[PDB]
Design a protein around this ligand. Structure first.
Ligand SMILES: [K+]
Ligand SMILES: [Zn+2]
Lengths: 112, 74
């Protein structure tokens, strides 16, 4: 072992545009080149862009992270940001599926 | 060389104040709703009420005097 010395689609890297609340520290994250429409954020229903209705139809390369939460708020936003940070490896990105009891508001969707 | 621009935005975004945070939050909502951002552009004043001051009190600028005006139709 060398001794310690005494003397020394592709994603864009940027900040999430819509901060959900005041005090949210801006973290440079892996970002989509274009905002995803709110229809493309839903795993249940198919939309114009895709007919997929569950995670099998998507065919993700990596394993999923499923978050079983009651309501989607600013806390759930603090769950997604660490997993999308720029220093996290891009190939090792894990799809995040939010299993919500209540339908998320358009404020949360616009933040994510 | 994009990392240089990323660092420039990082230091700027770290240095920004809470007033800038609140201002951008309002402007982001205004663009989302479609209103112009300009026109949103703080209160360093102290106000109080003087009930029936003596007739010697000096009148200052921006003073508002409460009046009881007589009935116009009477
Ligand atoms: K879908
Ligand atoms: Zn869609």
């Amino acid at each position: 072992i060398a001794p310690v010395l005494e003397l020394a689609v592709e994603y864009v890297k940027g900040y999430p545009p819509n901060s959900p609340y005041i005090g949210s520290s801006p973290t440079l994250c892996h970002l989509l080149p274009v905002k995803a429409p709110f229809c493309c954020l839903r795993l249940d229903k198919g939309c114009k862009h895709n007919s997929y209705e569950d995670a099998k139809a998507y065919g993700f390369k990596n394993k999923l992270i499923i978050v079983s939460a009651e309501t989607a708020g600013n806390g759930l936003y603090n769950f997604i940001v660490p997993l999308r940070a720029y220093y996290r490896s891009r190939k090792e990105l894990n799809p995040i599926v939010l299993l919500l009891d209540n339908k998320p508001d358009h404020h949360f969707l616009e933040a994510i | 060389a994009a990392a240089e621009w990323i660092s420039q935005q990082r230091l700027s975004l770290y240095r920004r104040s809470e007033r800038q945070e609140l201002s951008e939050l309002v402007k982001n909502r205004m663009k989302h709703l479609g209103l112009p951002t300009t026109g949103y552009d703080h209160q360093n004043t102290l106000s109080y009420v003087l009930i029936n001051p003596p007739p010697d009190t000096r009148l200052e600028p921006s003073d508002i005097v409460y009046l009881i005006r007589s009935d116009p139709l009477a």
